[PDB]
Amino acid sequence: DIYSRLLKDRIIMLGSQIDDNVANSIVSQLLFLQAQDSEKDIYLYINSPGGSVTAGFAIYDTIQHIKPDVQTICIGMAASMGSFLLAAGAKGKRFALPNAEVMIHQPLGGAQGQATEIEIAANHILKTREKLNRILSERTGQSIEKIQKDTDRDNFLTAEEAKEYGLIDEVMVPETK
Amino acid sequence: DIYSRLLKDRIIMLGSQIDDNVANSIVSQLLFLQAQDSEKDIYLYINSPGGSVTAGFAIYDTIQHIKPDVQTICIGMAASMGSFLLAAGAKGKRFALPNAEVMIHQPLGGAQGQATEIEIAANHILKTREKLNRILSERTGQSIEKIQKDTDRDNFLTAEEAKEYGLIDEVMVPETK
Amino acid sequence: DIYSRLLKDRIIMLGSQIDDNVANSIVSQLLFLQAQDSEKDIYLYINSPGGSVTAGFAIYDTIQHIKPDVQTICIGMAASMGSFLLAAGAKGKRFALPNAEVMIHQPLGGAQGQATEIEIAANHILKTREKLNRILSERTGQSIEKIQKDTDRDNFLTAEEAKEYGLIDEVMVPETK
Amino acid sequence: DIYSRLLKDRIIMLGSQIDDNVANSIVSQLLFLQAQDSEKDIYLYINSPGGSVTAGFAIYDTIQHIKPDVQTICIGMAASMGSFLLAAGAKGKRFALPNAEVMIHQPLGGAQGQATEIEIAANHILKTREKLNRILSERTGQSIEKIQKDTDRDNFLTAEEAKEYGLIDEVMVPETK
Amino acid sequence: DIYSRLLKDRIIMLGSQIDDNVANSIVSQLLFLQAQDSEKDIYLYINSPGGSVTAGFAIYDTIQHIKPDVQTICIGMAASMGSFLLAAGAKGKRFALPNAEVMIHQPLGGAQGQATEIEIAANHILKTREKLNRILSERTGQSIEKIQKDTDRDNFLTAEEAKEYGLIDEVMVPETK
Amino acid sequence: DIYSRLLKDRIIMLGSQIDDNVANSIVSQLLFLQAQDSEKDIYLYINSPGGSVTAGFAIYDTIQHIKPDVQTICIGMAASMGSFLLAAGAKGKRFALPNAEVMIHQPLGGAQGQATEIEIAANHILKTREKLNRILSERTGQSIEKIQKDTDRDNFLTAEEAKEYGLIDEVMVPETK
Amino acid sequence: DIYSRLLKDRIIMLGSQIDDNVANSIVSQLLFLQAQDSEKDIYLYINSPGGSVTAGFAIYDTIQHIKPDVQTICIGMAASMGSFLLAAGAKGKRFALPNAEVMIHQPLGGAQGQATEIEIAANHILKTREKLNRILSERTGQSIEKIQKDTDRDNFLTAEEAKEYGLIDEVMVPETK
Amino acid sequence: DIYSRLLKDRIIMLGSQIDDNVANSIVSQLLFLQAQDSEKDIYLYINSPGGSVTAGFAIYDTIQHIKPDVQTICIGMAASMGSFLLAAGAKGKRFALPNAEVMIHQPLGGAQGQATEIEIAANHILKTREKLNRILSERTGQSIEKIQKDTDRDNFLTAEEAKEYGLIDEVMVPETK
Amino acid sequence: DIYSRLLKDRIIMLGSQIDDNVANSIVSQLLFLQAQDSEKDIYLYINSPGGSVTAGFAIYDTIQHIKPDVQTICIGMAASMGSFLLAAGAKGKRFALPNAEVMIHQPLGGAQGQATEIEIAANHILKTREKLNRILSERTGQSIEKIQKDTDRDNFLTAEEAKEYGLIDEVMVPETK
Ligand SMILES: CC(C)C[C@H](NC(=O)[C@H](Cc1c[nH]c2ccccc12)NC(=O)c1cc(Cl)ccc1Cl)B(O)O
Numbered sequence A, B, C, D, E, F, G, H, I: 001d002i003y004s005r006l007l008k009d010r011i012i013m014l015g016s017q018i019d020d021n022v023a024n025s026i027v028s029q030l031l032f033l034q035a036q037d038s039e040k041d042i043y044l045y046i047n048s049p050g051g052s053v054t055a056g057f058a059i060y061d062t063i064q065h066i067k068p069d070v071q072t073i074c075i076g077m078a079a080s081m082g083s084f085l086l087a088a089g090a091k092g093k094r095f096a097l098p099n100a101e102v103m104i105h106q107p108l109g110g111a112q113g114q115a116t117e118i119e120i121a122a123n124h125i126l127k128t129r130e131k132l133n134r135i136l137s138e139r140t141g142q143s144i145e146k147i148q149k150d151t152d153r154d155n156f157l158t159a160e161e162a163k164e165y166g167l168i169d170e171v172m173v174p175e176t177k
């Protein structure tokens, strides 16, 4: 209704910025679908400009953790945290529509206060970047140094280039649902 | 609905800042579940950057007060009051997902007025800090003096570090709901 | 729902500032529960930073007026008008959770206009303070003179200190709902 | 619900400023309860700081018009138009709770524009004052001159003094609903 | 400079709204010019949309009081208080340029607060209107009831109609300074 | 300085919107230059988008009243009241530079209040429009009816079109000062 | 310049609200004139709607303190602190122009904070009102209780009424500088 | 000019809040006057509602440091830091005009940030209070414990009470400059 | 004037936050006093809450560069960069008045953008901190580690403690200019 009816078909729509509210809703729907049936696939549609790293990791870890395969399907755009969750779907079941776009880039943040507070914030966001680089590296088959170089600034990829990159497994063609 | 549906499985989702409204909601849900069944465990997911000390304590004392064990599960991030409540779960039943982050730091506040009013407010927040340090020492095994030094500035912990710190008992591995 | 299902258990949640809207809601629930059953206790949980004196008195006089005993349970914080209503529960049925805070202080207000109007507002808030002191004297056993001195500025009390002051009867211990 | 449930016991809750929207709701509820039963009393609880004179008169005249007796019960504060509606209840059935506050004062207003516009607005509010004094006189037994003098500035009354004045008939004592 | 140079020729320019600042400056210039020479005429140019009644009366009474004849010359527009000061120049020496405009209308004000404060405000602005009607009546040769009727709303007069009205003595024609 | 130094050359610069302050300055400069010499020409440069009708008539009538010829020279733009004041210069001495623009249109205004107030304001602005049409008719040799039609909406003219219209006498050619 | 030239004639223009800056300016001018000549009178024109009590008292006591007589001359309006200073001129040398208005009323202020702070502010402004009443009684010949009643609300006086009240000595007539 | 011409008479005017800008001006004037003449008295008039403690101490220490005696004359009001500087003038040369007010109270401030920053700010402002109490003790002959209690809240003093307190030496009486 | 005349006594007044405008002014005054005379001492008064590090370094290095000794005199408060410039005065000629305040603390900053930008900003302010510690160490005789530890949070010092610390050479006593 309309999402509630698609939920009955094990479909979840991720169609916005990823903040704490959106993460909790997505995680709750993943938990629910598994409680309903722990074997059948889940279908996660992603059209998102990104969002918070920790909200993204709530979703990522919940995907990794439950028993069902979570298929990921990029429609429109999956950028930043959105392309991270796209790459998080079950290997072999990560898709993009032919004109969907994918963007990857390094994390952003802020820091204010005493020199020692700024340095704690700096160190924390550097450690977070290395963790993201490492995980995306394992999700894509790329080296860590390739991820670091390719995310230094915004890096826009077509569906076909995202497949060659390893972020998705197949570009979805029409005539099938 | 979707949280109403998870509530039938005795799951509470704490996914935001902890203000007085959030705290009454969590407290009410804790009371509701005990009233339906005072023996079965409750599952409290925490994704929270923290919030008010007194709202936190409404949740904390209610967790300790009811008969059911309250399992705490950190997804994404438990910072500040979020990690105090994470530590507050039933011992042996405090978890974090593998990429969740935990952060601890001393309390923050504000004071304006006459010198004597500012002294009253300084004395109250120092006493609040001694009360928080004492309870976290009891919950983790760290000494009060170590809690004091370790919370002087922001202190970010991975899941495994939260385990060794004593804030949780196990890092959750996948292949199990 | 969630408060509605707790209502069925004769539980009323007071978890915000006390204004006219909040007071009207709490009086109604009290009135409602007496109509349902005039003998069975009511349970009033208090987490409030205070609020309006006249709205508080609407709750106070309604609590004293109905037949059911109204138990007061402080979770988190009962400050200012919050702690006055905490002290207003049936004697022997006024509680605080072990880490809840209680605070008492004199009333605050404002006045603007002609010298004559400022005098009228000052006289009114002073008489209101004497009325509050007299009632709190009756509820706690402390003398009016001691309440006057102890509320001159903000006075924060632990649960145990609130018991020795007479604001509550017991600190509630765990292992019981 | 919660007010709908109490309306089935012929209770109406007036707990805000009296404006046009509030007056329509109160008038409607009065009209509705008469329609259901034109003989049984109605219970109007009043916790109001006052409000619009014409909105107040919509309520006042509806109280006088309908067949049922309308008991007024002051909880918290009946100020300005609030206290006028308090005096409007059926004689013998006008109550205040022991610590409720009653306030009377003359009407306030504003005028802007040409001198003749300002004169028209002044004459209208002076006439309105004489109408209100004349009615409060019939309702209380005080003379118009005494009302005139006693409302020149804000006049705060305890529940007992409001009884001595004629605004209410009885202070309500406990051990009864 | 440029006004200071014209001041040496005994010319004052009133070219703005009449507030207390402007009145103080015009009055100071009148006092100065008389101090320089108490017998030669002064030339007051008026282009003004009006302003405060009391600021206007500061200027009016200073014109009436000093020894020199004050000639008044309307250029552009003299409305409200501006047409009052125009009519206040020495009889026989009040002028308008051929296309200048004159407007007369009743005073405007505001009033807020208690009925008795609004009535004092109304009474004062009505007495002020009668005083203005009376003085303008004597300046123009019209009856008081004619002034009252013609100022009920905004009343725009050409220079020629201002001369027939009595507000000015001659329409100034060209080829002279 | 630098305008003050052009003043000693009998040059006035009108380079902005015409309000009461600007009219005051221009009138004062006109009075001042006649004071210095009643015979020699004045030179009024006009680059103005227009402005207030009454402020414009203060300048217009002062131009007409004084003894010296006032030459008018359009540089850049003379629109609305600016082109009215361009046409006001001494006949035979009204100029535009080759690329100057002139614009004529009917007056604009506003009104709010009671129907009879709106009628007073409408009648006043229609009457002002007939006065402006008649003066421009005398200044240009065009008939009032043709002014009426040609000003119904914004009517932009080149310098050559303004000379054919009668608004200026000559388009000023270079090689002279 | 223009006030600097008038200061050469020992004239001070008080033409605005009385705030601390205005008061320091007036006080400095008073001291300046005494320093040039401690024997010749000073002329203080007052057109003022009032202002701060303590800034008024800085002017007042300085007027009383210096050797020169200070003549007070009301043009336009002396209201509130303005009429207190008018009354403060050297006896026999307090004037108003014939259409000047004088207004007297009780002081206004504001208080917010704790009951005891509001009591302190109420007490200070009542004692300030008794001080102002006592001095106005001495300057006018009215008894303190008549001042008290007459300033309860705004009390507008003509020049002749201000003379009969004792606030000035003479109404100024024309034909004299 | 006007303050400039008073400066030549060794008169300094302190008539506003005391911030760094004001303090820098007053210190400069004091330094300047000492350079001109190290032996002749300086006259410092005070009409100030107070201001910053450190800016005040910049003025205070400069007054004690220079050779010339600095007379302090309170006109209007010396409150807070204003009354501290009043008490700082050369003993026997500290004055108030008869209707000037004096007010003393404890310092006010604000703190925001971590618990340990709030503690640092509280300790600082308390130490500052003790330093001010000790110095006022020396300036007035009152004990520290009596200043502590008498400044707990706003303490308004007449000129006569300020003399009995020791804040000034004499009330200045008229017929002397 | 008043600062221009003090400048002829080779005095400079630093009495505000230190930004680029203030630094340019101070640097220029130093450059100008050296131009006038390269041997006579300069007197820099400091009442500053601090400000920009690079602005302060513009002043610091100019003090070190010019020929004359630059004496520094703390009046009121030298905080942050203020206390750094205080220590920058010629050794043996760094003073504080007896009640002046000195405060030292570490630098503060802000950073926003990509992780690599935040790292660049953190490294730059850490390097700035080591530079400031190193200079203050040479200026005071304290070790860098002690400076480091003593500036971790705001550190307030009396004038006497600033002497003991090595920020100044003497506390200035009175009876001397
Ligand atoms: C690279 C990609 C996989 C993730 C991107 N998200 C981010 O880069 C980071 C989240 C983050 C990590 N460490 C931080 C330290 C301080 C602040 C924020 C952060 N933050 C934001 O976007 C952001 C920043 C602010 Cl200040 C407020 C709200 C948000 Cl949501 B993306 O664009 O989806």
Ligand SMILES: CC(C)C[C@H](NC(=O)[C@H](Cc1c[nH]c2ccccc12)NC(=O)c1cc(Cl)ccc1Cl)B(O)O
Pocket: B049, B050, B051, B052, B053, B054, B079, B080, B081, B082, B084, B105, B106, B107, B108, B109, B110, B125, B128, B132
């Ligand atoms: C250490 C950790 C377990 C708690 C942290 N919470 C806090 O530190 C404190 C709550 C508090 C305790 N005593 C106070 C005295 C004055 C003001 C606030 C407080 N306050 C805030 O956070 C805050 C502050 C303001 Cl002004 C407004 C709203 C909030 Cl909610 B965290 O970050 O979760």
Ligand SMILES: CC(C)C[C@H](NC(=O)[C@H](Cc1c[nH]c2ccccc12)NC(=O)c1cc(Cl)ccc1Cl)B(O)O
Pocket: C049, C050, C051, C052, C053, C054, C079, C080, C081, C082, C084, C105, C106, C107, C108, C109, C110, C125, C128, C132
């Ligand atoms: C001591 C304790 C038991 C009560 C405290 N409440 C109060 O002190 C008083 C209510 C009151 C009584 N007499 C008044 C006269 C004028 C204005 C307000 C009041 N007022 C406020 O709090 C307040 C004040 C304003 Cl201006 C606006 C909104 C509110 Cl709600 B606490 O903090 O709970």
Ligand SMILES: CC(C)C[C@H](NC(=O)[C@H](Cc1c[nH]c2ccccc12)NC(=O)c1cc(Cl)ccc1Cl)B(O)O
Pocket: D049, D050, D051, D052, D053, D054, D079, D080, D081, D082, D084, D105, D106, D107, D108, D109, D110, D125, D128, D132
């Ligand atoms: C004496 C008592 C029984 C009633 C009081 N109500 C009033 O005095 C009057 C209503 C009124 C009557 N004649 C008027 C003429 C002009 C404007 C308002 C009015 N007005 C307000 O209250 C008010 C005023 C404004 Cl401007 C805006 C909104 C409101 Cl709601 B009380 O305080 O309950």
Ligand SMILES: CC(C)C[C@H](NC(=O)[C@H](Cc1c[nH]c2ccccc12)NC(=O)c1cc(Cl)ccc1Cl)B(O)O
Pocket: E049, E050, E051, E052, E053, E054, E079, E080, E081, E082, E084, E105, E106, E107, E108, E109, E110, E125, E128, E132
């Ligand atoms: C008829 C004509 C000769 C004068 C006109 N002036 C006025 O009508 C009156 C001044 C006045 C007299 N008694 C009052 C009572 C209350 C308020 C204002 C007034 N007031 C304003 O214009 C106005 C009003 C406000 Cl609220 C603020 C600023 C101003 Cl300046 B005109 O248009 O020149």
Ligand SMILES: CC(C)C[C@H](NC(=O)[C@H](Cc1c[nH]c2ccccc12)NC(=O)c1cc(Cl)ccc1Cl)B(O)O
Pocket: F049, F050, F051, F052, F053, F054, F079, F080, F081, F082, F084, F105, F106, F107, F108, F109, F110, F125, F128, F132
């Ligand atoms: C045809 C040409 C020679 C004049 C044009 N000026 C105008 O048309 C008129 C001035 C005017 C006359 N009678 C009025 C009645 C009500 C309001 C304004 C007016 N008004 C404005 O321009 C305007 C309008 C407002 Cl609402 C505010 C400020 C101004 Cl200045 B032009 O464009 O130079």
Ligand SMILES: CC(C)C[C@H](NC(=O)[C@H](Cc1c[nH]c2ccccc12)NC(=O)c1cc(Cl)ccc1Cl)B(O)O
Pocket: G049, G050, G051, G052, G053, G054, G079, G080, G081, G082, G084, G105, G106, G107, G108, G109, G110, G125, G128, G132
């Ligand atoms: C009766 C007559 C001779 C004086 C009148 N002045 C006043 O009545 C009083 C000054 C005053 C005395 N005790 C106070 C306590 C609190 C606040 C203000 C005051 N205050 C204001 O007017 C006002 C009020 C505020 Cl909040 C701010 C700025 C001002 Cl300037 B009048 O109208 O000239």
Ligand SMILES: CC(C)C[C@H](NC(=O)[C@H](Cc1c[nH]c2ccccc12)NC(=O)c1cc(Cl)ccc1Cl)B(O)O
Pocket: H049, H050, H051, H052, H053, H054, H079, H080, H081, H082, H084, H105, H106, H107, H108, H109, H110, H125, H128, H132
């Ligand atoms: C008792 C009397 C002799 C002085 C009073 N001044 C003060 O009490 C203090 C100054 C001060 C001392 N230690 C502080 C610590 C933190 C902040 C301020 C301070 N502060 C203010 O006044 C204030 C406060 C703020 Cl937040 C902003 C601007 C100012 Cl200027 B009075 O009223 O003259």
Ligand SMILES: CC(C)C[C@H](NC(=O)[C@H](Cc1c[nH]c2ccccc12)NC(=O)c1cc(Cl)ccc1Cl)B(O)O
Pocket: I049, I050, I051, I052, I053, I054, I079, I080, I081, I082, I084, I105, I106, I107, I108, I109, I110, I125, I128, I132
């Ligand atoms: C330790 C002491 C000797 C100096 C202190 N000054 C500072 O700490 C630093 C200046 C600075 C150095 N490196 C930076 C990197 C990023 C931003 C600012 C800085 N910055 C501010 O003060 C500040 C900060 C902002 Cl964001 C805006 C305006 C200012 Cl002016 B103090 O308090 O005098």
